[PDB]
């Protein structure tokens, strides 16, 4: 099936993970544990931010334009992308804004990380309906010496019923 | 011993909790709940933005000017602040910022609601050094129809160690 994972600041905004405050370790670990040998579905700034396809792991690149890098798969369409995943138990979309807005209403899960902490950003996760979802697991953590921030690991699964 | 409770929106910003979105219904029950029939103490701003004595308590308004109301002790000092609470096993510390500034070095246990919000506010709750404490229970809890932000209870313990 389809997942979104993200991490959130307040107001449930998103920028690229490589700048302050998703420099968090433990978020860092959260998304390696939980992506670790799945396809991953990426847009293309998201892309540009990384530099090199995530290890061990099928990486698709979802754009309009023409690819540039053979270590990646380019693809066009959600269906494309999601064709190239082929046969596995879990795909994780793993940002960014507008790639998480295309993929909201296949997914039936989502890994959010919820950050204590105020960033400015236009881009926001979308905004999933309290009503089609349900909270499974979270895990509230304090700020500590590696995290400057405290976090809530959480889980949702979508309703059926 | 001596206890603080606090709703803290994000970067530990506390305000009189009649404003938003200190109307949390769930934060409401969660302050009901943990003082219930325990003295508490109060900063004489937080007296004057409740109106009347919480129920079924002692209530002690800590300020330096003279009281107004017959329905509270009033006492100058944080010690007689606490002889007033007489041999009890828990003393409730209920507000505002500088009451919790002067009770944190006493205080053994915090109760605190991180809620998932940004507001104004030049009034932070006090720095508690996370090596001095130990976090023995935490709570995630989503939005919903009644409460308009994700919030989390916590509490948290003095170390000797
Ligand atoms: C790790 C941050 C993160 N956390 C959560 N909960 N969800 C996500 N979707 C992302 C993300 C992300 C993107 C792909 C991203 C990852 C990284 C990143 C950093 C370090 C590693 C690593 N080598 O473990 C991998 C990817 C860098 C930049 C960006 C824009
Ligand atoms: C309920 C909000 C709150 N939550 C947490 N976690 N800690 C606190 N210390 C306070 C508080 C507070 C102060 C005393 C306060 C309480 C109230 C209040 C509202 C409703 C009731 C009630 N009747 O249950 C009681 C107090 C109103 C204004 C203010 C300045």
């Given amino acids: 099936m389809i997942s979104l994972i993200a991490a959130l600041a307040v107001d449930r905004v998103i920028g690229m993970e490589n700048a302050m405050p998703w420099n968090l370790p433990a978020d860092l670990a959260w998304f390696k544990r939980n992506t670790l040998d799945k396809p991953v579905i990426m ?3 998201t892309w540009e931010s990384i ?27 959600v ?32 890994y959010l990380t919820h950050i204590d902490a105020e960033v400015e950003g236009d881009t926001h996760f979308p905004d999933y309906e309290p009503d089609d979802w349900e909270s499974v697991f979270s895990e509230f953590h304090d700020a500590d010496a590696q995290n400057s921030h405290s976090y809530c690991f959480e889980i949702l699964e979508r309703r059926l019923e």
Wanted: some cysteine; hydrophobic content about 35%; overall charge positive.
């Fill in 43 to 45: 847009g293309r700034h």
């Fill in 51 to 77: 530099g090199r396809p995530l290890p061990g792991r099928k990486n698709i690149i979802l754009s309009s334009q023409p690819g540039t890098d053979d270590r990646v798969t380019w693809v066009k369409s």
């Fill in 79 to 110: 269906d494309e992308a999601i064709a190239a995943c082929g046969d596995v138990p879990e795909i994780m979309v793993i940002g960014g804004g507008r790639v998480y807005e295309q993929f909201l209403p296949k997914a039936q899960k989502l």
